[PDB]
Amino acid sequence: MDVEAFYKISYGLYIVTSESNGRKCGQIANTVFQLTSKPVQIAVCLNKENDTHNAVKESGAFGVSVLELETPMEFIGRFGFRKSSEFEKFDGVEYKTGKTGVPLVTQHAVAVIEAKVVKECDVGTHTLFVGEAVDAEVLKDAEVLTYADYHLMKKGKTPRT
Amino acid sequence: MDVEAFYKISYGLYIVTSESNGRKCGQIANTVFQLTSKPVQIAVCLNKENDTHNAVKESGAFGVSVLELETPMEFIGRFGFRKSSEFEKFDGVEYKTGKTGVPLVTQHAVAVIEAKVVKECDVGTHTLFVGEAVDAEVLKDAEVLTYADYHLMKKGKTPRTATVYFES
Numbered sequence A: 001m002d003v004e005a006f007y008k009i010s011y012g013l014y015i016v017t018s019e020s021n022g023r024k025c026g027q028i029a030n031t032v033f034q035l036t037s038k039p040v041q042i043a044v045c046l047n048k049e050n051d052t053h054n055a056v057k058e059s060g061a062f063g064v065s066v067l068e069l070e071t072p073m074e075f076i077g078r079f080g081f082r083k084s085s086e087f088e089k090f091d092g093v094e095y096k097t098g099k100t101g102v103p104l105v106t107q108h109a110v111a112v113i114e115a116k117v118v119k120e121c122d123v124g125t126h127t128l129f130v131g132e133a134v135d136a137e138v139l140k141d142a143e144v145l146t147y148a149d150y151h152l153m154k155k156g157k158t159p160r161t
Numbered sequence B: 001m002d003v004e005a006f007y008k009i010s011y012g013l014y015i016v017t018s019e020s021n022g023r024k025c026g027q028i029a030n031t032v033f034q035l036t037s038k039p040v041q042i043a044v045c046l047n048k049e050n051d052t053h054n055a056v057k058e059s060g061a062f063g064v065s066v067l068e069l070e071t072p073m074e075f076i077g078r079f080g081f082r083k084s085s086e087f088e089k090f091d092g093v094e095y096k097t098g099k100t101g102v103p104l105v106t107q108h109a110v111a112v113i114e115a116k117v118v119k120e121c122d123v124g125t126h127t128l129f130v131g132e133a134v135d136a137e138v139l140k141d142a143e144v145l146t147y148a149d150y151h152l153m154k155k156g157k158t159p160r161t162a163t164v165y166f167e168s
C-alpha cells in the first residue's frame, strides 16, 4: 500500500472553531465536507487530542471559516501548530460570535458557516462530527485556498494575483 | 443562510466502485476524504437511492479511483446515470479486481484505493461509509481533477489553472 496515493485526495483548508466554558478554541482542518442537502449537514473530522475537538464534544456546536488563497503562512501556523488552551489564538485576530455561540473567524475568510452537532461518529483517533448548518455567509470575492495550494506554499511557492 | 457559502467547500472528483450479487457497480462522487492515518481510513458519502450505495452496504467493501484532470466528460458521464446496465458502465473500461472483490477502475485514474468497511454513519438521505484502506497505488504522474474544475469545464469556462499562479 503506497501512502502517496492518499496524497491525491483533494481538500480545502479551513479554521474549525468552538467555545466551551468561556474558552475559545480553533484549529486548522482540511477534513471538512458537506454530506447532505436535506437538511444541510456539514462534517468535520477532528483528532481526539485537540482542544477544539473537546470544545465541540462539550458544546455541541462548531464554526467553519473557509480560508482565502492569500492567507499568510503565519496565520495558518497560529491555528494549526499549537493548542488553544496554551496560546491565545484569537488575541490579535478579527472574529464575531455566531448564533450558536461559537467564535467565527472572519479574518482571511471567504465564507463562514456555523452548525449544531446532530451526530458524532467515533472513528478511533478522531471523531467525525456531523453538524446541521444554522447560518452561513459569504464574506469576500476571493479565491479559496486548497490543501494542494498549501502544499505548494510549504515548498516555497507563493500565490500571485 | 446563504447557500453560496457551501459552494466554497473544496472537493475532488472520483469514481466509487463496489460489487454485489456478482454485479459490478460504480458512481461518480465528490465526497471522498481520508479521516485518519493510524490506521488509514477513508470515508465515502453515498446517496441511499444509488445502486452503488446498496452494493457497498451489502458487500462491505469499496474502491476509489481519483480522476485525472483530463478525464473525458463522456467517461465521467458513463458513471453518472441513475439508470444503466453493468455492461453499459464497464464495457470497454480498463479495470482490475482487488482481493476484496471490488472492481478497481484504472482508466483515467491518477491513483486507486481499496477499502473494507469498518463503520457506517447514517446521516439521513445518505450513508457515510468508513473504510479501512487495504491497498492503494499511484498509477499516473497526471494532475487530479477537482470538483470546481469539473464545474467550470462542464460549463465551458477555463479551469483554475488560468487564474491561479504560483511563483517562487
Ligand SMILES: Cc1cc2nc3c(=O)[nH]c(=O)nc-3n(C[C@H](O)[C@H](O)[C@H](O)COP(=O)(O)O)c2cc1C
Pocket: A013, A025, A026, A027, A028, A029, A030, A031, A032, A045, A046, A047, A049, A050, A051, A052, A053, A076, A079, A080, A081, A082, A083, A084, A085, A150
Ligand atoms: C494544513 C493542516 C491541516 C490539518 N488538518 C487537520 C484535520 O483535518 N483534522 C484535525 O483534527 N487536525 C488537523 N490539523 C491539525 C490541527 O490544526 C492542530 O493539531 C492544532 O494544533 C489543533 O489545535 P487545538 O488543540 O487548539 O484544537 C491540521 C493542521 C494543518 C497545519
